[PDB]
Amino acid sequence: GTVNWSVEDIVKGINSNNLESQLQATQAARKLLSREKQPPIDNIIRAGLIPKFVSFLGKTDCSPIQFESAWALTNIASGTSEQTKAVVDGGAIPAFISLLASPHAHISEQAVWALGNIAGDGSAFRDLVIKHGAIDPLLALLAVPDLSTLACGYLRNLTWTLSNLCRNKNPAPPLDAVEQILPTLVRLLHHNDPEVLADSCWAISYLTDGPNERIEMVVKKGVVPQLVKLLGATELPIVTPALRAIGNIVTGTDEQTQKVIDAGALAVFPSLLTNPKTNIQKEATWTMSNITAGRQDQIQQVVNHGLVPFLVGVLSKADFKTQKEAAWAITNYTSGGTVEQIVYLVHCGIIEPLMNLLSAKDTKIIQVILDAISNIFQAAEKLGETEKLSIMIEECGGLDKIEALQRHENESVYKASLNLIEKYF
């Protein structure tokens, strides 16, 4: 019927002045474009079929040709930036926004999907989709008392499209657009579907990545308890964006960081810092470094949740990227922590795994470790226990490692290493 057609056959059928012949050639195009291996996107573009598909989107008296062009165009917009640009250049943005008002759920849905692919390309197409007024009709589709009345697949597509309108950074989405989307997005973050939750979390992770004003916008909507609750999910596709969003929030103000702690996020970190997935471990340790960079009372809540032995362990054995975040977490801890807090760190066995990381061929981690050691020696100076820590560093072969760093390429490494040896050894 409409299977294994050539581009020239589709061109013949679409160039006819027969709607049904156009409908069959459009179905044949969609099928060609749906295929898994090397669909001929560029061939369909070069043939000049995109304006033809876009014009078929307006054919209200033929709902199947609306669906088929919509699907065809969606798959062209899912390709490269030049391929998404072609769909936009064909004038498909206003055409797809009008389609959101279709009385046919499958056409309405295809429009939502295509707008998601266009917005997902980057900031410029994201903002162009917003300028053409996509947000109002998309949010009107979710204006129901209970989200559970909408079809699963339909709700998943809307949430994913909305997350792409929250995505990309130079620039970030317009503040007005973010403010209009946020109430629906919070409502989706409480919906009982795992894919809806994951995509809702991604959207929140995108909105919290940037200035503190943007973190504040999100935090004021009271999403932090829900993000902590999702941070404990058994589904990795939910934990990954949840931890991202929590990670972002703690890059902001101490007050914003505190909201995360108050919601009980640190209770989840014993598992997070031992998670089998490297990215979760790395992101959890990074989230930890920005918490230890906080107030002394925040460092105290880390101690209280027994998280210092968990940092000792990641420092001892983890992926080098996670171990790099762990060094940062210790340097931040020792920078703003009390003498009692720093003494507790040495007692938990921080010196040995900290010294073993001085063998690394990364200058930045060496710099971070040497600053942490300096901060630990300052706490030892205040108690008159400098010799105790000096022998402690000599016993685990720490001193030798600093001895070799005196003859290093980096100046900041060369200075700090030579300074510790003349001041304490």
Binding site: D209, G210, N248, V250, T251, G252, N290, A293, G294, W328
Partner: peptide
């Protein structure tokens, strides 16, 4: 101090 992405 605190570090962004």
């Amino acid at each position: 101090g605190k570090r962004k992405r």
